[PDB]
Structures are given as C-alpha cells and as structure tokens.
Amino acid sequence: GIGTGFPFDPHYVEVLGERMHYVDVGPRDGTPVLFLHGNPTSSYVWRNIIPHVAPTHRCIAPDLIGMGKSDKPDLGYFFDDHVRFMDAFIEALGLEEVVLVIHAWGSALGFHWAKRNPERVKGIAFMEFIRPIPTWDEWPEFARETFQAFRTTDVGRKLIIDQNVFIEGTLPMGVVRPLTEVEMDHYREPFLNPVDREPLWRFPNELPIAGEPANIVALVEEYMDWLHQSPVPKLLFWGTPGVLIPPAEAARLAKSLPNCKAVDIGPGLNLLQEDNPDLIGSEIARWLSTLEI
Ligand SMILES: CN(C)c1ccc2c(-c3cc(C(=O)NCCOCCOCCCCCO)ccc3C(=O)O)c3ccc(=[N+](C)C)cc-3oc2c1
Ligand SMILES: [Cl-]
C-alpha cells in the first residue's frame, strides 16, 4: 500500500523574518534535489518519492510560506510572495547548483527560478505543471464551473476559506485512487483555522487562464519560451486524463521541448505523486544517474 506516514525530522530556517520548514535527507555531498509542492499540498506530497532518491542524493523539500509546517505571515500569498520567500529560502540554505523536482504551483516557482538562474539548474523533473490556459475551454470540463467560482471574492472565498472546499473536495478530485483518512488529516493539518486558508484561495486566483491575471500569464509565457529552447535536461511525468496537462499535450511537449524524456504513470489527475509514487521516484533516481551532477 502507498505510505501514509511522514517520518522526516523537521528542519527550520529563518527566511525574511519567517520560519520555513523543510525536509532535508540524504548524503550531504553532491548536487541536491529540490522538491517544490503546490496547492493545497506540502512536502507531504513528496513523502513516497523522496525515499527513492535519498539513498544517492540530498533531498530538500520546503513547505511554501503559509503552508505545511512553515510560518503563516499576514500576507496576500500572491505568486510574487511565494517567489520572494522561495528565492530567499534557496539562498539561506546556501544552495549552488540544483536539480529541480516540481509540481503544479511548485512548477511555476521552479521554472521561474530556473529561467532567472539557468546556470544553477542541472535538470528539471516536472509533472502536471502550469502553462497558460488560453480559454476556459482548455480547462477540464468536470472542474470548469468550480474554478470559475473560485476566482471570485464572494463565492470563491465562501467555498475555499469558509468551507475548506479546496482541501475537502478539490484535493481528492485531483487524485484517481481514494485518499485515506490519515492522508486527508495530514493535508488538513495546516489549515484547521479558516484564517489560515488565504493561500488556498489566492493560488487559483493566480492561475493563468483566459489572459488573467495578465502579469502571471506573461511570467508563465516567459518561462515556457525559455523551456522550449533551453538545453536543460527535462523529465516529464504525465497521467490519464490529467488536469493541467492532458496526455496529448504531454506527448507534444516530449517532442517539442529539447532533451525531454516523458514517462506515463498510468491513471492520474493532478497529484500524480499520490497515484504512482514508486514509478515517479524510481524514474527520477534513474534519470539523475544520466546527468552531469
Ligand atoms: C462543504 N461544502 C460546501 C462542499 C462543497 C463541495 C464539495 C465537493 C465538490 C468539489 C468540487 C470541486 O472541487 N471541483 C474542482 C475539482 O478540480 C479538480 C482538479 O483540480 C485539482 C487541483 C489543481 C491545482 C492546480 O494548482 C465541485 C463540486 C463539489 C460538490 O460536491 O458540489 C466535494 C467533492 C468531493 C469530495 N470528496 C470527499 C471526494 C467532497 C466534497 O465536498 C464538498 C463540500
Ligand atoms: Cl490553484
């Protein structure tokens, strides 16, 4: 059965006046592997993937500011806030060159950091990642009216902040296999208090859909422009039917993006880590062995 525990010792670092929590396992020398989660998850989403990589490589998995075991400042939790705190996190750990393993909103953070710091990125493994969604027709039909309602300050905040729907409903609807009560309690833990749910609502309001917000659309277009030409080694995981990346898109990207290998994980929606963690971790471990790190 897929593991439900989170055995990792807590590590904390002060970042811009705030304490950020991170997993830090594996050997201390060599190039580290930095794991970035998205909405509404935490380093918990990497718990069954990291044990495949940690025998041979350092694994660092931070909880984004306002999420997981990290501190909860009184912020808007805009994408720009996450960019500021992640930039500062990476410098606080003194990381030099890295391999990135990134997912969904963590993929926007990772690709935006890689585009700005390409000399420091030796490879990117990614899955269910953020690209511009040009019209609402390109958002999955089964989740279209709900994400449209999320992108409002009235209904959207009622659902996500008052009623915790991103945790109770959107999260399980992002996994094909059923989540256990223990797993759901791990995802619920950072957000038991409704006043702490601001990141859960601002994230879907930042998604680059139908041209808004224009500033995020532009930023995401920029790192996609880079990714289509950069020689950086790329490993793309995808599932069927997917959410942000449908199978036909994954197959086109595997051909268009330079130096990109694609791996079919089988059934999957958004949190591919919850549907086939052993294939994702074992393929990352094999792919790392082919990099000059
Ligand atoms: C308390 N209260 C008002 C509600 C309301 C609605 C529900 C809903 C629910 C959910 C939705 C809903 O979230 N759709 C969007 C799905 O997007 C999936 C793809 O993105 C993944 C993340 C991508 C991130 C990218 O960055 C719609 C409609 C409903 C409904 O029932 O009306 C629940 C659904 C499932 C459930 N259990 C335990 C399995 C329990 C549910 O419980 C509910 C409770
Ligand atoms: Cl989101």
Numbering used by the authors: 3 to 295
What is written in the article reporting this PDB entry?
The specific and covalent labeling of the protein HaloTag with fluorescent probes in living cells makes it a powerful tool for bioimaging. However, the irreversible attachment of the probe to HaloTag precludes imaging applications that require transient binding of the probe and comes with the risk of irreversible photobleaching. Here, we introduce exchangeable ligands for fluorescence labeling of HaloTag (xHTLs) that reversibly bind to HaloTag and that can be coupled to rhodamines of different colors. Here, we introduce exchangeable HaloTag Ligands (xHTLs) for the reversible fluorescence labeling of HaloTag7 with rhodamines, opening up new possibilities in bioimaging for a powerful labeling tool.
We then developed a second reversible labeling system with different ligand specificity, using a HaloTag7 mutant, for dual-color microscopy with xHTLs. Specifically, we mutated the active-site residue Asp106 in HaloTag7 to Ala (D106A), resulting in dHaloTag76. The loss of the interaction of the (trifluoromethyl)sulfonamide of xHTLs with D106 resulted in up to 57-fold lower affinities of dHaloTag7 for these probes compared to HaloTag7. Hy4 and Hy5 also possess fast non-covalent binding to dHaloTag7 and, coupled to appropriate fluorophores, fluorogenicity comparable to S5 probes. While the chloride forms hydrogen bonds with the W107 and N41 main chains, the water molecule occupies the space freed by the D106A mutation and interacts with the W107 and N41 side chains. Both chloride and water molecules form hydrogen bonds with the Hy5 ligand. Hy5-based xHTLs showed higher binding affinity than the corresponding Hy4-based xHTLs, which was required in the case of MaP555-Hy5 for selective staining of intracellular dHaloTag7. In in vitro titrations, probes based on Hy4, Hy5, or S5 had >50-fold higher affinities for their cognate HaloTag variant, whereas T5-based probes showed lower specificity. Furthermore, both PAINT and STED microscopy can be performed in dual color using pairs of xHTLs together with HaloTag7 and dHaloTag7.
